[PDB]
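User: Can you write out an input/output pair for a complex, sequences first and structure second?

Assistant: Here is one pair. Inputs:
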Amino acid sequence: MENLIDFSGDGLDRWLRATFPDVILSVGLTNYGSLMTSVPDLSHFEQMARQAKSEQEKDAVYSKALTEATRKAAPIAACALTSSKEMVKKGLQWFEDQIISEDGNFLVWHQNYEQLKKAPPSFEQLMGYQMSALNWRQSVGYGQLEETAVLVSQVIAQFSVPGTLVVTVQEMIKDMIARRKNQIAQIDSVFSSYYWMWRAGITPESFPLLSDFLFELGQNARGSAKIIKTLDRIGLKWSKPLVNLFADSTFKMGRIHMHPAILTTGRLNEMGLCFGIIPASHPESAVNGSGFAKNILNVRTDGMNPSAQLIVQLFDIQRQSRTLSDLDVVSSEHLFHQILVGKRTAYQNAFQVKGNATDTKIVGF
Amino acid sequence: MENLIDFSDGLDRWLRATFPDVILSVGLTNYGSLMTSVPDLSHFEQMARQAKSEQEKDAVYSKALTEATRKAAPIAACALTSSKEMVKKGLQWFEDQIISEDGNFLVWHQNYEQLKKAPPSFEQLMGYQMSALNWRQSVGYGQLEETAVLVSQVIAQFSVPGTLVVTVQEMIKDMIARRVFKNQIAQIDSVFSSYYWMWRAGITPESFPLLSDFLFELGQNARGSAKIIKTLDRIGLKWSKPLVNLFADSTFKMGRIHMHPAILTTGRLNEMGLCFGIIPASHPESAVNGSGFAKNILNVRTDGMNPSAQLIVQLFDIQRQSRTLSDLDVVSSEHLFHQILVGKRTAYQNAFQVKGNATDTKIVGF
């Protein structure tokens, strides 16, 4: 259909008011305006977790928990900006401009995508990607909101939580350590998602197909096999090149070694942030919410720290649902890492954040 | 047959009796070795570039590694480690612990099968580190500077010849791309793990020379992993069957950097070679011909003209010019370099209690 996320000129603010006249955005529990009015109670997922038997069943419990935890947390204005017609057009055009200018920072990994579906990247390929992300954001004016800012700072040196959560949060730190200058391998969710859109041959015209589908994923967690079967149907013309990018079956090592520009079904959760909180062909449906893991970055860490409250619930559910699966960009400790490097939304770039997240100290209040 | 490495100042006297004519040198090594010159690995470049199959590529690097390390081992430390007295009490420790309910040992040992497939928990890593220290204290392993426990900080500056600075800086970047003691929590104690594997394999003080002779021969010429397995997985070889059964070569997929330090692979036989393969127990005087195992390079000096950096850079260039995709794990050039930066001056020192991050080290030219 059409991309109805369309504004130009206060365009963003005007469009929000025109499209969501009766919606009240809140920052009582989120950093930036969201639909979140309470902290989700995930206590029922423990019993589901315990009764899950197969590896797929256990993964589904955690995926469902994630979706419910994050259903209302996304910063709506940033999502509108990221999916607006003007930004989609500019964001896609950047890649052609880089091909024309034969920018080495882009090409050193782009040209090697097939190899990177199977092997970890070089330092040069990581640095080139980080440079490219900053370049893209500057070129398209992506940093027009606090929500979408480039961070130049230092890691959270101490993280203050309710006393009852201190030990578990400490266990998460330990967990990040056991799982093994700037943040060289950090995924820029927005930049990678635009790169995947461009590689998939998505256009301003076909974008709503992608956005609508991602919104559906945000309504109900799927599962890798199910996602592939859904996108690989004879009905859909737009999705085959996207699926072709998937490294689910090709990358055999741990995903923490995969280059941040390599797509998987799991990393559709990255694209959901950008294009799936508001379904472009029917944006009014956004009032129903849309749950993607890194929505949790917009949950506040001050006050009673609802962010810590949620992350701990997710971490406990993940443990109770323990598989051998590589959860990659939706693992609870990956999300916590993002919180520690200071991301206050999924749309901020944190490459130029110095320090080590694992070095943070957990304090009770 | 018999273990002829046996001394009850017994060490120095055994060295003088067993090696009457050889002068142990520290001109190029931290502790006395057979090394009197720095190997030139230049001929390995061409071979690396014009290697084509993965097995060919890995062979060039492995051959360069053997040549680089052939004479670098600290002989006294090796004799101690393979001595009858140490072999006996070193194995006995595991016999005592397996009936002792020490959780720091059992939390990883009891889950060895699971750890052949999956990364360890923090508890499993810490338990192993504490176990290695416990073992060293218990058997009195730290008798020599060469075999001591390090409590220190990663050195902030590493000084190399000016012509090496750029390449050494590239190695730092490579370490980074590959991704309080937290940074040392997964460090392999080469001696403790080697003793653990010897025990797991059902090797006794009596059958020990079989393992030692095999490893010494292994140190003479690089051998591909499949051929190593063939050597050990013999129809007939009873002694080595439990050893090959420990291998996680095909079971662990995550990337070897995530393997628990007490999990064995064919590649990690290079760890055992340090301990039991520099001197062949049943014929110790054969040791005069050398034995090349990767972490012999930790005994190469970093002062003077930094022969350590000289060799490490040559190995790094050969590895990258070979273009191998293999996860070389404990013989990878940047792994070896990492160990040099945390401050190991032989393979036999424990460096778990070293503060700092090796990748923060500044490279300066002299």
